């Protein structure tokens, strides 16, 4: 009998290549535009993943769009943290197999601070020694952890899906452990990490919003990312969105 976790493993997309061009000397604008082109393709991959995620299709189409538009940066930064953890133990930002940022390219304008923020996310995977299955369940919960303050169209369906994957995270914890000496402590630590992701990616999202709206900086965005940000941005800046937290603020 197939398990939900076994299905999360098989639907996880393969990692994308950048195609970045060595030949041009690096500039902050060129690098950020290259990263946004990669991000747009990773978001397309994430939409295909969400369509395959058991239960997601049960949601009203408008809620499917809301959840992807609200959570895309959390999904992308979490997966970047995982790749950087597995490929470098959190020492380098492993955007793609052909695009690694190490401390010496972080020195371009605007790159250092955002790169430190991305590395902190990877540093949490190292600190907690997160297992693949724990990561996969947590990543689903990120898709389900930012919602409109005034609710979703299919709220009861959403509540069912979210509780289902909360229990799946518990199952992933029990599989990681040899027995149960610290299953609650582990669940506490991982839900504290999920809660912290809202703040840990907030600076990335605000910088994304600035580079999107400030045409002066000449940072390019691909079409589907631009459409998503143009919808997400007014809702976030107006304070009409809320995180679903496990623990008291």
């Amino acid at each position: 009998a197939p398990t939900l976790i076994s299905l999360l493993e098989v639907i996880e997309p393969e990692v994308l290549y950048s195609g970045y061009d060595s030949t041009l000397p690096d500039t902050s604008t060129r690098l950020m535009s290259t990263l946004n082109r990669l991000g747009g393709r990773q978001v397309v991959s994430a939409v295909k993943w969400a369509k395959a995620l058991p239960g997601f299709r049960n949601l009203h189409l408008d809620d499917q769009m809301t959840l992807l538009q609200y959570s895309w940066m959390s999904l992308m930064a979490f997966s970047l943290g995982w790749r950087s953890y597995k490929q470098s133990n959190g020492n380098m930002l492993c955007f793609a197999p052909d695009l690694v940022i190490n401390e010496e390219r972080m020195q371009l304008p605007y790159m250092y601070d955002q790169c430190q923020q991305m590395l902190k996310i990877s540093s949490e995977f190292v600190r907690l020694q997160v297992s693949y299955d724990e990561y996969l369940c947590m990543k689903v919960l990120l898709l389900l952890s930012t919602v409109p303050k005034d609710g979703l169209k299919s709220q009861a369906v959403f509540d069912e899906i979210r509780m289902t994957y909360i229990k799946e995270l518990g199952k992933a914890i029990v599989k990681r452990e040899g027995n149960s000496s610290q299953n609650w402590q582990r669940f506490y630590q991982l839900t504290k990490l999920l809660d912290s992701m809202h703040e840990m990616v907030g600076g990335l999202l605000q910088f994304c919003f600035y580079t999107f709206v400030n045409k002066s900086l000449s940072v390019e965005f691909p079409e589907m990312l631009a459409e998503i940000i143009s919808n997400q941005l007014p809702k976030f800046k107006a304070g009409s969105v809320k995180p679903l937290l496990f623990h008291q603020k």
Partner: peptide, 10 residues
Amino acid sequence: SLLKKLLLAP
């Protein structure tokens, strides 16, 4: 909408 198109596509 590109996102909507993708969600509806096979």
